[PDB]
Amino acid sequence: MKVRVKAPCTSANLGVGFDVFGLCLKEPYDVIEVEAIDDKEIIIEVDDKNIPTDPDKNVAGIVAKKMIDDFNIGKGVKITIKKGVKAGSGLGSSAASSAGTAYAINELFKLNLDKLKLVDYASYGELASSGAKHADNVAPAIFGGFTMVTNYEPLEVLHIPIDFKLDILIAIPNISINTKEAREILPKAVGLKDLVNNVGKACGMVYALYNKDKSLFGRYMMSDKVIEPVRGKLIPNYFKIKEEVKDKVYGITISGSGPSIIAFPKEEFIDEVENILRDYYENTIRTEVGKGVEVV
């Protein structure tokens, strides 16, 4: 009685969509196995030893218990986790485990819950663990494609399938940013003009997706002046890299809280951009939009 799942990384904010937008990646991902066991206990194992194994501290254990309790499940579970990427990289690492666990529990115990509810449960875990739902990483991990968290409580998620091709390049710097550090960078207030600018550009990106227009999507994506200029200072060579790939990408910005960089290379310069990225960051991967947590 077990289930094995692939839970993908995700890239949130996407420039002008801070705390709303989320794009699901195909790679990297967490591989998670959940096994029903007879004694009413929650046991966790993770291939990354610094990660707590205490079911009350590990986001995966926190999600399992809440679901086990809510659905008055008899069994306990053994959760085995192979991490795709370290937390603090801006790639929704913790969200992958939260989403992956909610989705795996739903499968193993036949709960038949719809996706929005799985996002809710996964978010319960992120909240308990870090003080915030991080629904904008959890939603794309569960739905796949592009998502928008358009109300935080009650939680509402709008999903926009991405059916055209969208190559993605991810540069992963060897530094980290935890949830506390991410908030420190945030501006205290925003000028009316910036709100207007961001609302307009963010809405234009939605229009761009429905019109399959990658240039428009990427161009508007690079317009934020509220957060990006400050968040970008935290990433070595970010602005310089942005300048150097300028005409070879549809768009490039910071992934989530950073420090990872996400770029959408034009088809003709994909290897060149990958190479340029590698020259600054050895840990660079090539992916595409993902379909969300899937049974493997």
Place this chain on the structure above:
Amino acid sequence: MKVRVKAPCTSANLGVGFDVFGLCLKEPYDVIEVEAIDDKEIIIEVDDKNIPTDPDKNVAGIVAKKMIDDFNIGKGVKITIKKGVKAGSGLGSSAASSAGTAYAINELFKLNLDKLKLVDYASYGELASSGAKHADNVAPAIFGGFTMVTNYEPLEVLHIPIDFKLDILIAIPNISINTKEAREILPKAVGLKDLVNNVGKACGMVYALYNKDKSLFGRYMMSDKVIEPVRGKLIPNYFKIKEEVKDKVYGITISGSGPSIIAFPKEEFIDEVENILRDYYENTIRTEVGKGVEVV
């Protein structure tokens, strides 16, 4: 050389889309005529003398001028204007004359400008007469349907045709609000929470239009907490009316800077909602989404 046209009113902002969103109405509308005359004179006729006939001060005169200098239009022009609604009510009355003018000029002399260029010239008029492009009103007037002004400098406009029926009820309170005075009350800075809320809700409205979801569009429309709670205090009974038609409309908000109000009544309650609006205000009009300026 005679061109007769209909310039429609438009509703800008729509709650969370301020300075960006614009919706073209079918009515009210200006009726404008432009005939080619020989002398290098710009002559203006307007049903009411509250509207300045002097070509340098009347927006339609300005759009008429700057359009000839540019194109070397041989003969001068005389313009007849029948106003749809009183300016300063929040229905794009002025943009109706500007956009109506440019669309005619282009029509009358078979120039082949771009709907966008026409928006440009029309804005030039609103600009040359108020310093502001008022493009969020002029764009829907030209394009018809729903538009988004996504960049003010240069001008960028995205159009979303409204292919389904969208009933509209407009209430025009017998009061005036200084467009300018109501610029200072507006906060000049906003909290991050509001950036997040508005970006999410506005993007959700775009999603709603593509999914032809009136309910979602109207509910998100009523979610602004930056401008609406402030501007709405100056509209007698607005807040109380919003609560009263609560379940009978998909949504209800301020049209532009007010005092006019725009509601999307549910099919089932259109008569009753229009009656409630007539009971509070006196002037009500039942329309739907328009298609922009067209040859009559």
